[PDB]
Amino acid sequence: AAPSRLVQPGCFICRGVAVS
Amino acid sequence: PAPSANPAKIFIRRFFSAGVAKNVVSYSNVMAAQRAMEHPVAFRCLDKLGLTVQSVKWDVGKDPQNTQVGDGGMSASQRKALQQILQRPNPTMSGAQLRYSAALSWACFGRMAFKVSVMSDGSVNAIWPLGIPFLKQKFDRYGDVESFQYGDEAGKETIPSFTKVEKNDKGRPIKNYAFMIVKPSINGAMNFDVQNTPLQAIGVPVALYDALMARAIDSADGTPNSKWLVTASRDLDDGQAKEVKEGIEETKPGGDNGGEIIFIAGTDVKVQEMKNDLSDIHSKVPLDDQARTIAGNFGIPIALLYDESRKAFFEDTIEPGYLTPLEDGFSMFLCGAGYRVIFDRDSIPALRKSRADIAATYDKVTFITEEEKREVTGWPA
Amino acid sequence: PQVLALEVDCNIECASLLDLYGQIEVSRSTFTYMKIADYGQLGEYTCDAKCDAEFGEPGNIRHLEGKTYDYRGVFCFNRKNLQEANYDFLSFMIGAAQRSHRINRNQALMIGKGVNEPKGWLTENCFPVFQTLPVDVNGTSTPAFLAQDWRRFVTSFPAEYGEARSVMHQNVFGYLAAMVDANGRFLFGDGDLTFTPDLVRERIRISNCLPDPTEGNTKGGTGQDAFAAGSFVAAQAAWKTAFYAVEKRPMFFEQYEGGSSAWCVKYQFGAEDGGFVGCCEHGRILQI
């Protein structure tokens, strides 16, 4: 089988305040 | 008591793999056993072995080598129920039919399997013979089987074996179980070995038998059965060649122009009589030897297919190859020590003469007490 | 020339979403049941000193019914290799069709499309479906699915409906256990190399032939790995009343004399079953 990636969830925190 | 550590763990490490429910007989053996019930001589041998054992009468009784003063007839009522069940197994089947099915499967595959329905107290309620071709079993981790798988999808009743089952305070089980009596072979492998049945070493001769009988069928219908190959000449005026044919033809039994000479004026016709031997179609000489071998491998005197040979057939292949393994298998786990299943030898119609004479001569013996004169010819006490 | 008994097969089943749905057994192939639409309003807060009353408005009681559909197939042989084989095609094939039945049934009860197959609760699309908000990253508005959503989804079930389990492909549960907070810590199972709580206590039955939003476990999502918003992630329902699976007769296998032309012995198998969605208010769907 071809080498498949293993992307895992990122550094996920926020949904309501964008950074300046 | 039980050490639970047998040297039969050689096979689970590599040779086998735990928890797989392997079949007990190879499919090739199953199909070989199937067509062996259709072969003329093979089926004849199988039913002969079957009917002989089916004739014997059962009973439960005290065993002769009773050194166990603590008799294993735990209740003496389970023994009566066990007596009842040996004479009347599960409904729609009697003990005669059970003995027949057991020995047949023992002849074709070298195996015997059963099932019990002990109520709650060692009182066995019913017995069922188990179809050996499609029986799967699962081994433990150490050296032996735990349970039996019977059927592919719907029936999955993993009937536990006798070794692992809810036992009573005395040792008798309380729930159902199975037996799986096995015929030993080389290299041990008590349960992990190949089967031992006469069908192993009769494959070639039955192939020879069927091939020659095939030659018999083809050569029976296909060869001309006519005689008198009459041939004319090339100057015979077709229009009387029929007339000549009618003349020779009109002599059939009765003839009309019958039983009389055939007179032909000129033009010599030439007749030659065809032999048509047709008396060696089945190859008689290389046939009975094939019949003899696949009969000898089954252990039957050729004379059976004089009375001395019948007695030999009874006490050399029937008794210690079908009766003593079945009896000892049941006696192993169907009741406690001191009591076991017995069949009466005097129930054999051919052995009556010999039992009669040995009793008469022993009667003449004097330096022997009465009790040992009994046990040497049955008659416990 | 030393054939073994090794029978490496290496094929998988799913889990079974059968012990959840309410089970009912029917003999006839056409059953019928009643439904209470609404009790309706009866009686107002009338004034005093009024020798009168109001008839209100009576309720409604519907009468529904549903059939049972059949499932059958055919497989045959050649009767020549069947006699010389060192194995058993039959017992392998009988297991090979019932293997196809169990997976076709469970899948059909999920994704069944109307005619001659029980309407699955997925395609029925009357379960109220909840979709999650997307997140920001470097200005991009990729869709995502945080642990904050999962706790929000499970708790939003109405309490008076009863207890309700949840169903999801195991790849999302692996996505749950492998989340990280800001600095470096895992959200679940802090510092034990693995997070595996007793699922039966968190009311999470797991399966493997659900839409599986994280494609082949390769769609976590920071760049071009976004969850492709509009995908099923998990479901939750009081299954003992939200969906029923009916059963009439288990599988059978019957030789077909006729059609077997002395070369090709032909067996026949079939079974009867069915299902239908009950009150599809108990039960909600989560999506990206």
**Interchain CB distance below 8 Å, C135 and A5:** no
Q: Contact at 8 Å (CB) between B181 and B329?
A: yes
Residues in chain C: 288
Residue B264 CB-half CA count within 13 A: 19
Bridge-partner residues for B149, per DSSP?
B136
Three-class secondary structure of residue C134 per DSSP: coil
Residues from chain C contacting residue B152 (CB–CB below 8 Å): 91, 94-95, 98
User: Looking at the partner chain, which of B28, B134, B152 has a beta carbon nearest the beta carbon of C86?
Assistant: B28
Three-class secondary structure of residue C102 per DSSP: helix
Residues from chain C contacting residue B28 (CB–CB below 8 Å): 85-86
Bridge-partner residues for B114, per DSSP?
B129
Bridge-partner residues for C137, per DSSP?
C140
Find, among B123, B122, B99, B125, the residue nearest to B112 by Cα.
Answer: B99
Question: What is the number of other CB atoms lying within 10 angstroms of the CB of residue B145?
Answer: 21
Q: Contact at 8 Å (CB) between C60 and C38?
A: yes
Give the span between the Cα atoms of B158 and B136, in whole angstroms: 9
CA separation, residue C231 to residues A13, B218, C126, C211, C213 (Å)? 22, 71, 16, 7, 6
Tokens read off for B209: 């038998």
Tokens read off for C14: 């799913």
Mutation choice for C interface testing from B27, B39, B134, B193 by most C CBs within 10 A: B27
Give the span between the Cα atoms of C59 and B23, in whole angstroms: 64
C81 lies within 8 A of chain B by CB: no
The letter for the amino acid at B193 is D
Q: Contact at 8 Å (CB) between B124 and B134?
A: no
Residues from chain B contacting residue C96 (CB–CB below 8 Å): none
Residues in chain A: 20
DSSP state of C186: B
Tokens read off for C100: 């196809």
Query: Any residues with CB less than 8 A from the CB of B231 and at least 6 apart, and which?
Result: B269, B270, B271
Q: How many CB pairs under 8 A join B and C?
A: 24
Find, among B73, A18, B54, B340, the residue nearest to C135 by Cα.
Answer: A18
Q: Contact at 8 Å (CB) between C68 and C249?
A: no
Through-space distance between the first and last CA atoms of chain A, rounded to whole angstroms: 45
Give the span between the Cα atoms of B128 and B193, in whole angstroms: 25
Q: Contact at 8 Å (CB) between B9 and B142?
A: yes
B270-305 in b/e burial notation, b at 16+ Cβ within 10 A? eeeeeeeeeeebbeeeeeeebbebbbebbbbbeeee
Beta strands in chain C (DSSP E): 22-25, 30-38, 60-67, 69-76, 129-131, 165-169, 205-207, 232-237, 243-255, 266-277, 284-287
Question: What is the number of other CB atoms lying within 10 angstroms of the CB of residue B178?
Answer: 23
Find, among B54, B33, B52, the residue nearest to B100 by Cα.
Answer: B54
DSSP state of C165: E
**Interchain CB distance below 8 Å, B22 and C86:** no
What's the CA angle centered on B158, arms B154 and B162, to 5 degrees? 150
User: Looking at the partner chain, which of C179, C182, C216 has a beta carbon nearest the beta carbon of A9?
Assistant: C179
Residue found under tokens 């039969």: B8
The structure was resolved to a resolution in Å of: 4.5
Give the span between the Cα atoms of B88 and B9, in whole angstroms: 39
C5 lies within 8 A of chain B by CB: yes
C255-276 in b/e burial notation, b at 16+ Cβ within 10 A? eeeeeeeeeebebebbbbbbbb
φ, ψ of residue B325 in degrees (nearest 5)? -75, -40
Q: Contact at 8 Å (CB) between C107 and C121?
A: no
Bridge-partner residues for C234, per DSSP?
C168, C286
**Interchain CB distance below 8 Å, C217 and A15:** no
Three-class secondary structure of residue C33 per DSSP: strand
Chain breaks in chain A (C to N over 2.5 A) after: none
Question: What is the number of other CB atoms lying within 10 angstroms of the CB of residue B2?
Answer: 6
- Closest CA of chain C from A9, distance in Å: 5
CA separation, residue B329 to residues B189, B340, C108 (Å)? 18, 10, 51
| Elucidation technique | cryo-EM
User: What's the burial of B181, exposed, middle or buried (CB within 10 Å: 0-12/13-18/19+)?
Assistant: buried
Q: Is C230 left (phi over 0), alpha (psi -120 to 50) or beta?
A: left
Residue B321 CB-half CA count within 13 A: 20
Tokens read off for B358: 């040995």
Residues in chain B: 381
Query: Any residues with CB less than 8 A from the CB of B45 and at least 6 apart, and which?
Result: B294, B295, B298, B300
The letter for the amino acid at B243 is E
- Closest CA of chain C from A16, distance in Å: 8
Mutation choice for B interface testing from C9, C88, C253 by most B CBs within 10 A: C88
Q: Positive or negative, the Cα torsion across B106, B109, B110, B116?
A: negative
User: What's the burial of C177, exposed, middle or buried (CB within 10 Å: 0-12/13-18/19+)?
Assistant: middle
Tokens read off for B280: 């060696």
DSSP state of C107: H
CA separation, residue C163 to residues A11, B56, C283 (Å)? 33, 66, 11
Kind of pairing between the strands at C165-169 and C232-237: antiparallel
Give the span between the Cα atoms of B143 and C180, in whole angstroms: 49
Q: HEC string of chain B?
A: CCCCCCHHHHHHHCCCCCCCCEECCCHHHHHHHHHHCCCHHHHHHHHHHHHHHHCCCEEEEECCCCCCCCCCCCCCCHHHHHHHHHHCCCCCCCHHHHHHHHHHHHHHCCEECEEECCCCCCCCCCEEECCCCCEEEEECCCCCEEEEEECCCCCCCCEEECCCCCECCCCCECCCCECCEECCCCCCCCCCCCCCCHHHHCHHHHHHHHHHHHHHHHHHCCCCCCCCEEECCCCCCCCCHHHHHHHHHCCCCCCCCCCCCCCCCCCCCEEECCCCCCCCCCCCHHHHHHHHHHHHCCCCCHHHCCHHHHHHHHHHHHHHHHHHHHHHHHHHCCCCCCEEEEECHHHCCCCHHHHHHHHHHHHHCCCCCHHHHHHECECCC
DSSP state of C216: G
What's the CA angle centered on C222, arms C221 and C227, to 5 degrees? 25
Residues from chain C contacting residue B26 (CB–CB below 8 Å): 86
Kind of pairing between the strands at B339-343 and B58-62: antiparallel
**Interchain CB distance below 8 Å, A14 and C135:** yes
What's the CA angle centered on C68, arms C284 and C109, to 5 degrees? 30
User: What's the burial of B355, exposed, middle or buried (CB within 10 Å: 0-12/13-18/19+)?
Assistant: middle
Give the span between the Cα atoms of B61 and B176, in whole angstroms: 24
Tell me how far apart the 2 most distant CA atoms of chain B are, in Å. Answer: 110
CA dihedral C208, C211, C217, C219 (to 10 degrees): -170
Bridge-partner residues for B147, per DSSP?
B138, B160
Find, among B33, B29, B10, the residue nearest to B192 by Cα.
Answer: B10
